[PDB]
Amino acid sequence: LKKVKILEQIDENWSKEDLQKLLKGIQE
Amino acid sequence: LSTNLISKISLLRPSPIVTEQPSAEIREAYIENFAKGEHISAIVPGQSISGTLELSAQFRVPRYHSKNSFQQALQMKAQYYRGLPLYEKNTLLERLKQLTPNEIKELEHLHDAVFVNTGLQNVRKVRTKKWKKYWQYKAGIPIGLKRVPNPNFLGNCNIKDFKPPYI
Amino acid sequence: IPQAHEIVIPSYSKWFNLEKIHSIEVQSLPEFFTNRIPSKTPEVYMRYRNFMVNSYRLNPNEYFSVTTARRNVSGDAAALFRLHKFLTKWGLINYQVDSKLLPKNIEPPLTSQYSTRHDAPRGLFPFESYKPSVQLPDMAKLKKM
Amino acid sequence: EIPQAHEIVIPSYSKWFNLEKIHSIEVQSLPEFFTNRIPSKTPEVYMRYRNFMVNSYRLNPNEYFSVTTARRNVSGDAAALFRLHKFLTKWGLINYQ
Amino acid sequence: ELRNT
Amino acid sequence: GEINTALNTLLVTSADSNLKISLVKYPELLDSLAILGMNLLSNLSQNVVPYHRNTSDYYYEDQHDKMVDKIFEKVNNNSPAVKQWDLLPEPIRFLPNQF
Amino acid sequence: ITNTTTRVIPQVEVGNRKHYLEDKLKVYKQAMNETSEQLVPIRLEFDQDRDRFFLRDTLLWNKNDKLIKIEDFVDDMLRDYRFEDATREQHIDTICQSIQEQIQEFQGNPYIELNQDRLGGDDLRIRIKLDIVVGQNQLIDQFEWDISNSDNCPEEFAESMCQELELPGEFVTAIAHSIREQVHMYHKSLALLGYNFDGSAIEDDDIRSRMLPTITLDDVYRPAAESKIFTPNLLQISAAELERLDKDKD
């Protein structure tokens, strides 16, 4: 389906692990 | 309540060092008369740390020459203890059977330059250990880490934290 | 025959000769080489070099100060200070002395990592109403119908 | 390192003040440290003097950090130190509380 | 400030 | 925000006719107003946008050894000029746009 | 405090002092015509006799500085010394006139800086002695200082000495002031006797006996009993002395 692939925003100042820890921290 | 869901439910939602005037009433009376321009009875120094850096009442330039070992040489035409390691008995003796009294005056000042440098290094270390406890003492820290609080107290500000509307 | 120790010079200062004057020193310290002042001669400069370096090499974990110099060598204090800076830039003396044992400034310590609050004036921030709803809206009735 | 033992407040128009960085207002207010005419007034000297004054005020913010103690503790002429201290206390940042 | 009673 | 909330709080008080703004007690407010009006007239005739620039906005964030540091760029691989600027820009005449 | 009955409060002050309002045009008129500095050593001594204050502070001062009015700086200094507001019958004018006199006598760095500058200077090495009291410590030290060299920095040597001795910082701004004092009081005595600072030919008896002789090959090491004077002694304790000869010098 037309799913939002949110972990493709991996521009060099950030990273995939940084985005994952960001989302898990805002959920925490 | 099923264990297929219990592992996922918490997954989806994780929820004697200073040298001032220690009397706190003569320092104030000193300034109360100093603004008028008057001396007082007792004395008041500026604050500092204790300790004296006393040189030349300490390690001197050594005397490796005798009372006449230079003028007679002029006639005949000639691991560490403090900073220097202790030499063996036989190895240093032939080394001092090599040198000339043109270099004895060099050697005396070289060994004095080692001695004064060590005697400054250890006092410098002690002085840094004293200043690190001076600056902590003058800033409210105790060491080595009805009262009414002023607004410049740690945690007693007047600017209260305003909360956002979503919180 | 005599006792020997271990000395460590950095690799870019291998050109140093204990008995010769290098060309770097005549363009770095030009006051000893004008050949016009008789008190600053190129032969008495070696007596400063072979008293600084050859005294530091006897115990390289002691910081060679400059008050140890002008106590003995009886030269101008500013010339000895400039030569002591020149021999420290190339790492000849004061190299194997451990850091934090080097002499540091007696100053108030750093207050860089301090948290500050701000006095903002009265009309800077707007008035805010309408608390936002963090919770997602539910559409159970729409998909049920 | 000394832990924070006081409440520190600078005014909101001094939001730009950051250590180890020189803002444009500091250049346009004290230009003599940035026109390379005198070798004893470099921006490193300016950063040393400014960081000294700001670090020395924030140890005890209830005390008025006078010009005379700053003159007695760093080496320099009294005019430039007086002008830098008056510029610094003009923008909050020292003697604000 | 030391407001005493 | 610090400019606009100062300008609005000056405009409300100055039009109030019961609260006096005297410059004998403080004569450097008027210089701030006039220098702000100068610098807004400058970047309006050149269509420069202030207050939200993408520039860094900070300046230089960081003897007998300057020849030693010059040859230090030789034996490691083995004098700055003066500045000139004014407080205020040229008026608005003597600009290349303004004829 | 803002939560009040809507007054206009111009410049609520800190430390009982109105804020210093700059000129911002004379600052640029001075900072762009900024050739040299010419620091001036300034000495202030007052007693309980003939004066009421004591005020034993010593400071440097830029002679070419035309920005700061000197009476404003002296009035700021007296407020920093916590003198009460009766500070004009214990005049600011006396201190202002003393500082006005002491910068007028400063003849500047002479032709060693003005006309010529020989790289390396001359053999004019002078015997600097200093005696500083801070708290209950007394620094007593002597060394040699070339007064004929322009690139001799007193402040860079004072910071170097207080680095090695781990001195607090009053010694940083006292040693450099002592160097700037004694070098100037030798330069003034040289200039008032018409020294003609390029060709040396010193030709006097009080000076040329204070100057130090030429270091030879043999004299590159000082004697041991002569070495114990040229060493810094940290004699801690208070001081006690006086000074009154007005008549004797008259």
Chain B residue closest to A28 (CA)?
Answer: B14
Chain A residue closest to B11 (CA)?
Answer: A24
D5 touches chain B (CB under 8 A): yes
Q: Quick check: D12 and C117 CB within 8 A?
A: no
- How was this model experimentally determined? cryo-EM
Chain B neighbours among G 147-186 (CB < 8 Å)?
164-166, 168, 170
What is the torsion angle, in degrees rounded to the nearest 10, for the CA atoms of residue B19, residue B22, residue B26 and residue B32? 70
Task: Give the three-state DSSP class for G74.
Answer: helix
The data reach a resolution, in angstroms, of: 6.9
G6 touches chain F (CB under 8 A): yes
Full 3-state SS string of chain C: CCCCCCCCCCHHHCCCCCCCCCHHHHHHCHHHCCCCCCCCCCCCHHHHHHHHHHHHCCCCCCCCCCCCCCCCCCCCHHHHHHHHHHHHHCCCCCCCCCCCCCCCCCCCCCCCCCCEEEECCCCCCCCCCCCCCCCCCCCHHHHHC
Closest CA to G221 of C40, C73, C75, B113: C73
Phi, psi (5° rounding) for residue D53?
-65, -40
In single-letter form, the type of residue at position B72 comes to Q
- In angstroms, the CA G54 to CA E1 distance is 32
Helices (H), chain G: 26-31, 70-80, 92-104, 154-165, 172-191, 224-227, 246-249
Chains touching F (at least 3 CB pairs under 8 A) are C, D, G
- Residue C39's Cα: distance from chain center in Å? 31
Helices G154-165/C77-89 angle, 10° precision: 70
β-pairing verdict for G39-43 and G137-146: unpaired
Q: Quick check: D24 and F57 CB within 8 A?
A: yes
Q: Quick check: B37 and G233 CB within 8 A?
A: no
G59 touches chain B (CB under 8 A): no
Asked whether at least 3 C-beta pairs link G and B within 8 Å, the reply is: yes
- In angstroms, the CA D36 to CA F84 distance is 10
Q: Quick check: C64 and B117 CB within 8 A?
A: yes
Which residues on neighbouring strands pair with residue G146, listed in sequence order? G125
Under 8 Å CB-to-CB from B61, ≥6 apart: which residues? B108, B109, B112, C72, G224, G227, G228
Q: Quick check: F21 and G8 CB within 8 A?
A: yes
Count CB neighbours of D68 within 10 A: 19
D12 touches chain B (CB under 8 A): no
DSSP label at D14? G
Count CB neighbours of F59 within 10 A: 15
Q: Quick check: C28 and F68 CB within 8 A?
A: yes
How far does the CA of residue B132 sit from the closest CA of chain E (Å)? Answer: 29
Chain C neighbours among G 182-221 (CB < 8 Å)?
214-215, 217, 219-221
Under 8 Å CB-to-CB from C128, ≥6 apart: which residues? B164, B165
- In angstroms, the CA A13 to CA B2 distance is 42
Question: Which of G7, G11, G32 comes nearest F84 by C-beta?
Answer: G32
Count CB neighbours of B147 within 10 A: 7
